[PDB]
Amino acid sequence: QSALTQPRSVSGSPGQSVTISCTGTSGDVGTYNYVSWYQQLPGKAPKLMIYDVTRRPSGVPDRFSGSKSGNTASLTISGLQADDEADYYCCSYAGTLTWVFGGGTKLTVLGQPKAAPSVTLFPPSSEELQANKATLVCLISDFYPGAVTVAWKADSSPVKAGVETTTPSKQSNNKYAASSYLSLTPEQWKSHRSYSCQVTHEGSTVEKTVAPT
Amino acid sequence: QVQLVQSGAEVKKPGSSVKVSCKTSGGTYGTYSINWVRQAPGQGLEWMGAIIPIFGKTNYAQKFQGRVTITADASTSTAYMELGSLTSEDTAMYYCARVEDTALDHYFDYWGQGALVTVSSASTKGPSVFPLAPSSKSTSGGTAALGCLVKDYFPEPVTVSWNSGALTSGVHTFPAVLQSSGLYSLSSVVTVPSSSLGTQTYICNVNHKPSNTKVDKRVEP
């Protein structure tokens, strides 16, 4: 009736092995051998990885194995690859036409080579300024590990209003990306000498600058 | 191959009722079941209920019994899930999943693409698209980033292509931000040779199905 219990997060370096637990009750996991495991990438539907506690569907690499003891099933991933970073959900049959899911576990692969972020700063389009708005757009890409801090500057001074920043998201090359937006009126944009996007990654601070010129 | 295709994203007022469809094609008429699983933003998958259309059999989780009703038409292999008395706790992505053989299979092999249902009193709004001009040069090709800013739309999602699909790699569409106003905004950028921009015309195509809007925007220097 309630969700199966999974750890919130697991981590490991490339080539290592990790395991993700899924604890249910005697009524679902302890009774049936119908435990399945699904992988979900950011922004996609779940994909079946280990149905029938131990079986792999065709195409699923042999690095994914499944286990069960008593009321607890476990997904084991050997030889971690960066492509495995995802949310993993366990599922159990719990009676006739009934299933129960676990809470999910976020799997991140740390220890990959460091990558400095590419930073691009776009000034407000003159079309937007014609529409009586101004938006500064600072896009950050190709960085690893997937975490940065973004600050904005009005000619030297920190600006914290009108700033909206995404959480880092994975790219298709296993690196990360994010974006930050600074909302300004046309007058505030025209009245200053420059605006600066300053991106900090693992202690290193780079910056780009645009001007009303 | 087996394909489960669902209805699109939708915004619904609180207290309304929402209906999501799942058409299966390529799927061996028989004792298959369609299961409905929802996922609140940033949350886990939650099984809601299931139907065996060949037998007309339905079952529901206790949390949703009495509020969700699942129906089906085997003649078109389509399933429907209707959820009533909507609140903002019901805002979620709603997936259909399939069980191929209810007597033999006890897992979900195929999933729909999911339909995002946003429960809100705010109105649907199409996006405004603005160009992000390169305005810079590095070399013959070197570096050049241009793009499109998709601003002030509701609800999610929007899709972005470049030149209607002619420009495919080196394009990067960032996840949207949710502004203080409750509206979304994202950007999508392509990196092309610096020689190209004198020659080639660059257009971004934004599709916002919830508002039935399509916007083409050419990115000039």
Numbering used by the authors:
A (entry chain L): 1 to 9, 11 to 27, 27A, 27B, 27C, 28 to 95, 95A, 96 to 106, ...
B (entry chain H): 1 to 52, 52A, 53 to 82, 82A, 82B, 82C, 83 to 100, 100A, ...
What is written in the article reporting this PDB entry?
Comparison of the RSB1 structures, unbound and in complex with DS-Cav1, revealed a root mean square deviation (rmsd) of 0.75 Å over 235 aligned Cα atoms, thus indicating little global conformational rearrangements are necessary to bind DS-Cav1. Despite the similarity in overall structural conformation, two side chain re-orientations do occur between the two states. The first is the RSB1 HCDR1 residue Tyr29, which is a key component of the cross protomer interactions and is notably shifted by ~ 4 Å relative to the bound state. The second change, LCDR2 residue Arg53, is also shifted by ~ 4 Å and repositions to form the salt bridge with Asp200 in the bound structure. Together, these minor local induced-fit events support a relevance for these interactions with DS-Cav1.
